[PDB]
Structures are given as C-alpha cells and as structure tokens.
Amino acid sequence: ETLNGGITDMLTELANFEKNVSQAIHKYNAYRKAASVIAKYPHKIKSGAEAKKLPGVGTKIAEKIDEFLATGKLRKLEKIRQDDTSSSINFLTRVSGIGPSAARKFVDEGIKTLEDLRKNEDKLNHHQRIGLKYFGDFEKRIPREEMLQMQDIVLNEVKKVDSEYIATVCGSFRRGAESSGDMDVLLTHPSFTSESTKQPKLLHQVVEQLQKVHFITDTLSKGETKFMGVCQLPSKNDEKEYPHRRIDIRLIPKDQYYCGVLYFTGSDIFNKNMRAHALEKGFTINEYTIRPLGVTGVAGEPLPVDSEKDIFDYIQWKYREPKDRSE
DNA sequence: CATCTG
DNA sequence: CAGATG
Ligand code: NA
Ligand code: NA
Ligand SMILES: [Zn+2]
Secondary structure: OOOOHHHHHHHHHHHHHHHHOOOOHHHHHHHHHHHHHHHHOOOOOOOHHHHHOOOOOOHHHHHHHHHHHHOOOOHHHHHHHHOHHHHHHHHHOOOOOOOHHHHHHHHHHOOOOHHHHHHOHHHOOHHHHHHHHOHHHHHOOEEHHHHHHHHHHHHHHHHHHOOOOEEEEOOHHHHOOOEEOOEEEEEEEOOOOOOOOOOOHHHHHHHHHHHHOOOEEEEEEEOOOEEEEEEOOOOOOOOOOOOOEEEEEEEEEHHHHHHHHHHHOOOHHHHHHHHHHHHHOOEEEOOOOEEEOOOOOOOOOOOOOOOHHHHHHHOOOOOOOHHHOOO
C-alpha cells in the first residue's frame, strides 16, 4: 500500500502506455498483473531478483524495477513523458468521445490539440462534437449543492409524467459525497419487468419531459433503456450560468431495481465485501439479483427483493445507510 | 453492456 | 457486421 508504491506506480504508467500509444494489450496486461501482485506483496522489494520471484514478474520487469530502485527514475518512462506523440493521445483522449483509437488516427492526421480539433470539427462525430464543445464543463466536478438542485428537478418531472415512476440517483451522491463527476439516475416502473416485453416509451417519455423544461440539453446516446446525455440547471437571474453536466438515465425492470440501486451505489469495496459475505451466507449477488447457492457447486433461482432491505436480510446483515456504504 | 458509426 | 467509447 506504500511499501511498493513506486513500483506499482511506474508499472501502471508503463501499462497504460502500452495500451494507449502502442497497441500492446499483452504488454499492457503484463504491467497490470505485475502491479497487482507486487501491490499485495507484504515486503519491501529491495531488488528485481526478489520481485522476479513473484508471478507475473518476469525478466523485463525485473530489469525495470532494478533501474528504478537503483536510480530515482526510468529511461523509458522518461522518454515516454517527453514525446509529443504519446502526450497527444493522452490529451485528445480527454475529450468525451475519443478513445485511444481515435486519438491515434487524429494524431496521425496531425490533430494534437484542442484548436486542431475545433478546426477539424468535420472530422468529429456527434458525441465527440459535444465532448469538444464542453471540454471544460466536463472536467468540472459537481458540487453536491448543485446535485440536490438537480435531483430536485429530475424527481419532480418524473413524477408528473407518471406517479408510478421510481427514480433513484445512485453514485456517491448517494453514499454522501460532497461532489461528484456526473449524475446517474436509476429508473423503473411497475409495468416493466424481467419478462414484461419491453416498453421504450417508458424511458423516452421522461427524457422528453426533461428536455421539455430544458433540463436536458443534448443527447450523447439514446437507446431503449439507456440514455446518455447533457443537462443543466437553468441559470437563475443572468450573471451566472451553470456548467453543462454529464447525465445518465437508465430503465430497469422493476423486478431487479434494488440490486441495481444497490450495486450502482457502491462503493466498489462495500460491494465486494457484501458480495463475499452473501457467498458465505449461502448466496450470490450481482448487478441484477440475488440467488440462493446450491451445494453441487453452484445453483440459480432469483430471490425476491422489494427494497435494499430485502437484500441485507437475505445475507443476514446490518442495514447499511448509504452514507456508510463506503467500505 | 448498450449504443453508435461506417 | 466489427469495433469503438462510456
Ligand atoms: Na475520451
Ligand atoms: Na478480430
Ligand atoms: Zn520482508
């Protein structure tokens, strides 16, 4: 957790690069486990040979760990941190809609910066275009004080459209966080479930309402169950307009809400622990459900949930206020 | 994993 | 349809 921090960090830089700049997914996976294993390792890696001893750790990485241990830096890491091509890609990538793939194409075309992009708006697609247009807003965290205003609006409109709607704002906003990255809304309706054959209007209606009142500003992607978009709290009395925020809305069959709502609320760690305890308590838990575990190895069959309460009980645990769902 | 692009 | 991105 700190006894091998550098090692792990360097490794992570290395991995990332293989993957983003080069195409080196193997290499890239290579850096990854190594860090993971070294990450657990209980001692102070005093040498490469010592690390090598570990699995995941081979010859080349040992080499690297040596040079790093020996001199506060790495040549390769050095050479990578400079290189404009490499940094270009790490940069373009910040735009919402550019993955490495695209970052590489663009750079080869010579777009390596914000303006470059602007000049080449033709070459960008709708998601990318929006990303570019709100590059700044997009990097801005979301203060909970804004989040509350947000949630306030969303929930009121969802209600007006259909009393039977059930909306929840997951994320850390939920676990109490002071600020957040984007707004995740979990959505469901009684008339929609596991078997019930679809209902696209179910989602399309609200999205529509939201736009109606101008809360939603643009659409990133709009499917029958998942909607990726942009919203914005109406600027009060002109002088201060808000940033544009990322927002997601997703339809869930009522029969697996709370597992979702559970899950999406995190944190990753709380999940894992809850996950592991359920397994003890003779169960299985996933994004959508909780099933009893047969001894034959495994075994199915969806238990029935009506609240995040039904779930805990099952695995026989203390209800966890979201605030304390941390780890 | 769901959506888009081309 | 494969392949990209979130
Ligand atoms: Na990106
Ligand atoms: Na292939
Ligand atoms: Zn030791």
